[PDB]
Enzyme design. Structure first.
Site, PDB file in Angstrom:
ATOM      1  N   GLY A  33       0.759  -1.234   0.000  1.00 20.43           N
ATOM      2  CA  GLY A  33       0.000   0.000   0.000  1.00 20.43           C
ATOM      3  C   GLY A  33       0.797   1.296   0.000  1.00 20.43           C
ATOM      4  O   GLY A  33       0.216   2.365   0.109  1.00 20.43           O
ATOM      5  N   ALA A  34       2.121   1.230  -0.097  1.00 15.69           N
ATOM      6  CA  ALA A  34       2.913   2.464  -0.123  1.00 15.69           C
ATOM      7  C   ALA A  34       2.510   3.385  -1.295  1.00 15.69           C
ATOM      8  O   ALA A  34       2.492   4.608  -1.162  1.00 15.69           O
ATOM      9  CB  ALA A  34       4.405   2.152  -0.157  1.00 15.69           C
TER      10      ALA A  34
HETATM   11  N1  LIG Z   1      12.460   2.673  -0.088  1.00 12.88           N
HETATM   12  C1  LIG Z   1      11.690   3.877  -0.147  1.00 12.88           C
HETATM   13  N2  LIG Z   1      12.153   4.995   0.409  1.00 12.88           N
HETATM   14  C2  LIG Z   1      11.437   6.139   0.362  1.00 12.88           C
HETATM   15  N3  LIG Z   1      10.233   6.174  -0.249  1.00 12.88           N
HETATM   16  C3  LIG Z   1       9.714   5.076  -0.823  1.00 12.88           C
HETATM   17  C4  LIG Z   1      10.459   3.880  -0.778  1.00 12.88           C
HETATM   18  N4  LIG Z   1       9.741   2.958  -1.405  1.00 12.88           N
HETATM   19  C5  LIG Z   1       8.621   3.501  -1.829  1.00 12.88           C
HETATM   20  N5  LIG Z   1       8.547   4.796  -1.491  1.00 12.88           N
HETATM   21  C6  LIG Z   1       7.474   5.710  -1.798  1.00 12.88           C
HETATM   22  O1  LIG Z   1       6.288   5.057  -2.164  1.00 12.88           O
HETATM   23  C7  LIG Z   1       6.229   5.018  -3.566  1.00 12.88           C
HETATM   24  C8  LIG Z   1       6.201   3.603  -4.137  1.00 12.88           C
HETATM   25  O2  LIG Z   1       6.355   2.556  -3.218  1.00 12.88           O
HETATM   26  P1  LIG Z   1       5.900   1.031  -3.415  1.00 12.88           P
HETATM   27  O3  LIG Z   1       6.847   0.058  -2.783  1.00 12.88           O
HETATM   28  O4  LIG Z   1       5.860   0.728  -4.906  1.00 12.88           O
HETATM   29  O5  LIG Z   1       4.494   0.849  -2.718  1.00 12.88           O
HETATM   30  P2  LIG Z   1       3.285   0.040  -3.308  1.00 12.88           P
HETATM   31  O6  LIG Z   1       3.885  -1.015  -4.226  1.00 12.88           O
HETATM   32  O7  LIG Z   1       2.437  -0.682  -2.280  1.00 12.88           O
HETATM   33  O8  LIG Z   1       2.378   0.930  -4.128  1.00 12.88           O
HETATM   34  C9  LIG Z   1       7.381   5.826  -4.093  1.00 12.88           C
HETATM   35  O9  LIG Z   1       7.017   6.757  -5.042  1.00 12.88           O
HETATM   36  C10 LIG Z   1       7.924   6.543  -2.931  1.00 12.88           C
HETATM   37  O10 LIG Z   1       7.454   7.833  -2.810  1.00 12.88           O
HETATM   38  O1  LIG Z   2      -2.316  -1.119  -3.011  1.00 15.64           O
HETATM   39  C1  LIG Z   2      -2.356  -2.157  -2.070  1.00 15.64           C
HETATM   40  C2  LIG Z   2      -3.721  -2.789  -2.029  1.00 15.64           C
HETATM   41  O2  LIG Z   2      -4.009  -3.330  -3.292  1.00 15.64           O
HETATM   42  C3  LIG Z   2      -4.684  -4.529  -3.108  1.00 15.64           C
HETATM   43  O3  LIG Z   2      -3.833  -5.494  -3.608  1.00 15.64           O
HETATM   44  C4  LIG Z   2      -5.934  -4.562  -3.930  1.00 15.64           C
HETATM   45  O4  LIG Z   2      -6.795  -3.523  -3.638  1.00 15.64           O
HETATM   46  C5  LIG Z   2      -4.907  -4.768  -1.655  1.00 15.64           C
HETATM   47  O5  LIG Z   2      -4.728  -6.132  -1.333  1.00 15.64           O
HETATM   48  C6  LIG Z   2      -3.879  -3.894  -1.025  1.00 15.64           C
HETATM   49  O6  LIG Z   2      -4.294  -3.350   0.189  1.00 15.64           O
END
Ligand SMILES: Nc1ncnc2c1ncn2[C@@H]1O[C@H](COP(=O)(O)OP(=O)(O)O)[C@@H](O)[C@H]1O
Ligand SMILES: OC[C@H]1O[C@](O)(CO)[C@@H](O)[C@@H]1O
Ligand SMILES: Nc1ncnc2c1ncn2[C@@H]1O[C@H](COP(=O)(O)OP(=O)(O)O)[C@@H](O)[C@H]1O
Ligand SMILES: OC[C@H]1O[C@](O)(CO)[C@@H](O)[C@@H]1O
Ligand SMILES: [Ca+2]
Ligand SMILES: [Ca+2]
Ligand code: NA
Ligand code: NA
Lengths: 308, 308
Positions: free
Chosen positions: B248-249
């Site tokens: 969820g980042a």
């Molecule tokens: N290692 C990190 N350090 C700082 N910011 C990060 C890092 N990883 C992710 N982010 C932030 O979150 C965003 C993407 O992260 P991500 O791992 O792909 O999360 P998700 O896959 O759940 O969407 C980046 O644009 C950045 O702003």
């Molecule tokens: O972005 C992260 C989110 O995306 C999902 O995979 C689908 O909605 C959830 O399982 C998770 O919380």
């Protein structure tokens, strides 16, 4: 050689059981999977046929069964559908404690070609989830007919979970059709009363008389079990324990029952049946001592120590 | 009054996240639910419309959203279908880390009558799961058209989860149709390359040029984000953290982005956009500090302290 194979079919499931606020235990489950493992733990010969999903829960259940020395040659992965996932509420018990998140799960897609070769004297145990939807419903009735045809024996435990049925109005008649096919049927008290529309075990048993079921066993929770055979009713009871988790206790019961019938020279004999139910009661009690249907399924050293 | 409502629609989900051998954390999740909570935690005005199941997970997600001060007037319980349940593998990241156990879950049954009244200047944020199957796919495209019609703004984050699509061959074209409707589109690097069939961000951005998307943001994990507006590309980056849980980042990122656009006088302004992305980056980083998509979504005191 007189140890006969017991075939189990139906739903292997991951039961998510609360354990700490914010946490679930990932517990292997699914009534026929539970029964299979119960028999294996008693050193019996059990084997499972059915479908789980091609997913980590399905693989976890395959791993679990094989670890428990249950033959899983005929456990297949469905290419499309997911493994059953059930959330348990420990403030409730039995059917009322379960929420089924995957409907229809992979096991509901059991096909005729999934049925293995059966032999004379073998056992087949079924629960009603296998009958809930097509094609599993018709496939499972075919498996029952094939086991009867070859001179095997059929055990049925309704183990009702209404929410799994897409057409719940079909549950009563479908379940009772399977009751009429079985050699051994196990009910909880409430399930017997529900399926017959009665208000007591006495009326319930009268309502199934015409079925001429060779062995009916009605579990009575702490009070043990009522054993009904032609022209005889007898209560068999052992030590009551305080349950820690009731999940799957009725499957442990069936496991001990069928283990002892499966190793008998002639299971029809009253002494063999009563002894088998004594084991069933002990298994059911011990099964409640840990969370998870399979966790405290006993081995013989444990059961003998408890029954002594 | 210039704080505009942000509507979120799609899938609220329970994410089961390993935490101890044999245990899962029961974590609230679902990308648009995550975004909603991210905006609320920053003191924004967010509201959710969609369907969860009439089950404990659905009720848990309703409770979670309302606790987080997300308007859930338009969160409905589907009478038949179950709430999405996802198993997370922490050895993987993003799409590869998720297994969807409920397909199709309740959110896939979003109907036209589930769409709330929209007003000029409001935002609508959508992810691709909402487009995966009918009727949610057509309902969601209708919601997008209605928001455009009234003079609101549309944000889209593909957030690809292919396995949710019954017809995965429809994913590319369906997703790109939504990309063409949006004012703001956020991609991960890999998602941009996948949807355009390219091997770099440069070629990916060229491949979407004709779409004339007002704001595209490409996240670069630790390297921050690429901000593409007409005739301009700029990388915006802040402090890299070591993630504890990446789940969820990218939704935290979107949450900070849309919070700041939603409170702007004129979100189109380059200074407003760049500042909004600075917040997005900080939110994305902080979100990784605890397990669960929502757990470490920051408030302003935390974000300001981190960005300083
Ligand atoms: N290692 C990190 N350090 C700082 N910011 C990060 C890092 N990883 C992710 N982010 C932030 O979150 C965003 C993407 O992260 P991500 O791992 O792909 O999360 P998700 O896959 O759940 O969407 C980046 O644009 C950045 O702003
Ligand atoms: O972005 C992260 C989110 O995306 C999902 O995979 C689908 O909605 C959830 O399982 C998770 O919380
Ligand atoms: N409190 C108990 N004390 C001793 N044995 C029990 C007790 N509860 C259940 N059992 C055993 O297990 C059987 C039924 O238990 P039950 O709670 O209904 O398990 P489940 O509902 O999972 O099938 C009984 O027949 C009995 O043998
Ligand atoms: O008998 C207990 C078992 O029955 C089920 O409800 C359905 O198979 C499982 O969730 C549980 O393990
Ligand atoms: Ca039972
Ligand atoms: Ca994402
Ligand atoms: Na147990
Ligand atoms: Na987190």
């Amino acid at each position: 050689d007189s140890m006969s194979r017991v075939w189990l079919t139906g739903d292997a499931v991951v039961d998510l059981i609360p354990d700490g606020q914010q946490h679930y235990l990932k517990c292997p489950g699914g009534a026929p999977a539970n029964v299979a493992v119960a028999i294996a733990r008693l050193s019996g010969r059990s084997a499972f046929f059915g479908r789980v999903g091609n997913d980590p829960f399905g693989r976890f259940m395959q791993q679990t069964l094989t670890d428990e020395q249950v033959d899983c040659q005929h456990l297949h992965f469905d290419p499309v559908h997911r493994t059953s996932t059930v959330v348990v509420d420990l403030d409730e018990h039995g059917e009322r404690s379960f929420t089924f998140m995957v409907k229809p799960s992979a096991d509901q897609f059991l096909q005729l070609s999934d049925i293995p070769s059966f032999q004379k004297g073998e056992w087949l145990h079924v629960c009603s989830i296998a009958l809930a939807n097509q094609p599993s419903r018709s496939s499972t009735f075919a498996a029952i007919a094939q086991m009867k045809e070859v001179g095997g024996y059929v055990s049925f435990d309704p183990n009702l979970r209404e929410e799994v049925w897409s057409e719940p109005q079909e549950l009563q008649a479908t379940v009772m059709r399977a009751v009429g096919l079985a050699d051994v049927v196990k009910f909880s008290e409430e399930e017997l009363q529900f399926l017959t529309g009665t208000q007591s075990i006495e009326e319930g048993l009268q309502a199934i008389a015409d079925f001429q079921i060779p062995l009916v066993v009605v579990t009575l929770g702490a009070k043990g079990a009522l054993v009904a055979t032609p022209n005889s009713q007898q209560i068999v009871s052992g030590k009551a324990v305080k349950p820690i988790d009731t999940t799957g206790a009725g499957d442990a019961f069936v496991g001990g029952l069928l283990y002892r019938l499966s190793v008998a020279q002639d299971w029809h004999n009253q002494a063999t049946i009563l002894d088998a139910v004594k084991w069933a009661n002990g298994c059911g009690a011990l099964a409640t001592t840990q969370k998870g249907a399979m966790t405290a399924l006993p081995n013989q050293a444990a059961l003998y120590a408890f029954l002594e």
